[PDB]
Nucleic acid binder design. Structure first.
Length: 58
DNA sequence: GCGATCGC
DNA sequence: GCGATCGC
């Protein structure tokens, strides 16, 4: 689980600051990849994945 | 296509 | 079992 909030655009189309429920690195062998957060849209109650900043702690 | 994750 | 998440 994550700690600090993340500047996120929701599926519903709104800018929100949300603390991700799970975070992990998504990277192939030999390449940097990205960090991924699993988020819950507070309005709709639905889950979605979003890129995390590069320095976000896993 | 690779990489991990999980709600659906 | 997969969509969808990014950047290479």
């Amino acid at each position: 689980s994550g700690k600090k909030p993340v500047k996120v655009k929701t599926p519903a189309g709104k800018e929100a600051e949300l603390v991700p429920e799970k975070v992990w690195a998504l990277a192939p062998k030999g390449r940097k990849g990205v960090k991924i957060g699993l988020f819950k849209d507070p309005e709709t109650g639905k889950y979605f994945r979003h890129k995390l900043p590069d320095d976000y702690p896993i």
